[PDB]
Write a protein that binds this ligand. Structure first.
Ligand SMILES: Cc1cc2nc3c(=O)[nH]c(=O)nc-3n(C[C@H](O)[C@H](O)[C@H](O)COP(=O)(O)O)c2cc1C
Ligand SMILES: Cc1cc(Nc2ccc(C(F)(F)F)nc2)n2nc(C(C)(F)F)nc2n1
Ligand SMILES: CCCCCCCCCCCC[N+](C)(C)[O-]
Ligand SMILES: O=C(O)c1cc(=O)[nH]c(=O)[nH]1
Length: 362
């Protein structure tokens, strides 16, 4: 506790006085040099979950955009998370938009950003992930922890499909899953090309899987797609059908929104909003896609999750796992420890045997 306590005092201080992205990069640096706290607790066997044959030791991970370049994977995971989604990465490095490009509102526990997909590029991030996988072989606390890779297109790309293909051929061997972050017909083409290129990694290697997939599952990465919440009902239906036709392994609901306008400090700011003001929107979106897909597509929840209650709402709506981002900014390093306990107590109060029982109850 005192390690978490001292750090969360420092974090509250940083939140008040210091620029967001500067703060973010400082703590990533602290994590890189391994002086952040550990959650070495055993996670409840009743809160374990899965997406098909991908097994999560607990239902909480860190969303994409937090550690874009995979420089801090060990330390973030050891805060008590079961998985992390690095990226979004692009084939070539991008600077992103002009700074400052991230702003926080403590009162509403919300964030707005216009980063513009800044990242070191696929080559550098692949090497970062490779080094992590090597460390993981030797680190007890990283056993069975999952790393997904969010992939996207370069800002001025000629061909989206071959941007994703480039990334998959580079980093796919080291990923437990791939998250696509980008029209229904166009999406179908993207999804199938990704599945095909992952299937080709298996073909063009002479090694058995144990020595081919240098990841956690020792199997080929699953394919998820992340959806933005700013769509009409027809677009959601169209997308839903595509996700069924393509037999995609899961869907991440959701990314940031642009339809929040009741935050004063953000009134003259451009970008996508996350945090508490996104919670209700993203939850409704989960129910909708859970319906439109007839519950055949596992869901990864993202948007305004801060508490065990928030989490159980996402789950009862249809989600199998939850991702945090804003929670770590406002609640600090105790976030995983705190929210895991709250969910466990709640699952008991509501009289659930395990977490899997609660999925899609409402
Ligand atoms: C600064 C910032 C950068 C982000 N970068 C990415 C990204 O690169 N790829 C992605 O899929 N989502 C990105 N996101 C969206 C988050 O992954 C997440 O979906 C969103 O913040 C909602 O979660 P939350 O309400 O818990 O913060 C980013 C969000 C923020 C605030
Ligand atoms: C205090 C603080 C800490 C922090 N980042 C942070 C919080 C917790 C952790 C850790 F728990 F993983 F250590 N790491 C980084 N961020 N990130 C942003 C933003 C919105 F600009 F991205 N603002 C932040 N403010
Ligand atoms: C305001 C500064 C806060 C100081 C926090 C105290 C430092 C504890 C960090 C030790 C982390 C150790 N370990 C072994 C988990 O890495
Ligand atoms: O890098 C960004 O600007 C970004 C990407 C993304 O997927 N979502 C978001 O809110 N910002």
């Amino acid at each position: 506790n005192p390690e978490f306590f001292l750090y969360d005092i420092f974090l509250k201080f940083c939140l008040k006085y210091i620029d967001g992205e500067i703060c973010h990069d400082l703590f990533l640096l602290l994590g890189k040099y391994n002086i952040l706290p550990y959650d070495t607790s055993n996670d409840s066997i009743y809160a374990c979950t899965n997406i098909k044959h991908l097994d999560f030791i607990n239902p909480f991970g860190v969303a994409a955009g937090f550690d874009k370049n995979g420089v801090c994977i060990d330390s973030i995971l050891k805060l008590g998370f079961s998985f992390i989604e690095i990226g979004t990465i692009t084939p070539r490095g991008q600077t992103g938009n002009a700074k400052p490009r991230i702003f926080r509102d403590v009162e509403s526990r919300s964030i707005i950003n216009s980063c513009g997909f800044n990242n070191m590029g696929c080559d550098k991030v692949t090497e970062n992930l490779i080094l992590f996988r090597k460390r993981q072989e030797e680190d007890k606390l990283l056993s069975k922890h999952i790393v997904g890779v969010s992939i996207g297109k370069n800002k001025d790309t000629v061909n989206i499909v071959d941007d994703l293909k480039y990334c998959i051929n580079k980093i796919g061997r080291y990923a437990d899953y791939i998250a696509i972050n980008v029209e229904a017909g166009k999406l179908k083409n993207i999804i199938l090309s990704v599945k095909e290129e992952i299937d080709n990694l298996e073909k063009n290697n002479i090694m058995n899987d144990e020595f081919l997939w240098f990841n956690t599952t020792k199997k080929k990465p699953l394919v998820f797609v992340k959806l933005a919440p700013d769509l009409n009902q027809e677009q959601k239906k169209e997308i839903a059908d595509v996700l069924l036709e393509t037999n995609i392994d899961g869907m991440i609901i959701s990314n940031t929104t642009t339809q929040i306008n009741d935050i004063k400090s953000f009134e003259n700011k451009k970008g996508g909003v996350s945090g508490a003001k996104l919670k209700d929107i993203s939850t409704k979106f989960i129910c909708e896609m859970y319906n439109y897909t007839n519950k055949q597509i596992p869901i990864i929840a993202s948007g305004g999750i801060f508490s065990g209650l928030d989490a159980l709402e996402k789950i009862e709506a249809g989600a199998s796992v939850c991702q945090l981002y804003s929670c770590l900014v406002f609640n600090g390093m105790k976030s995983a420890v705190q929210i895991k306990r709250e969910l466990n107590h709640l699952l008991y109060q509501r009289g659930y045997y395990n977490l899997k029982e609660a999925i899609g109850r409402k």
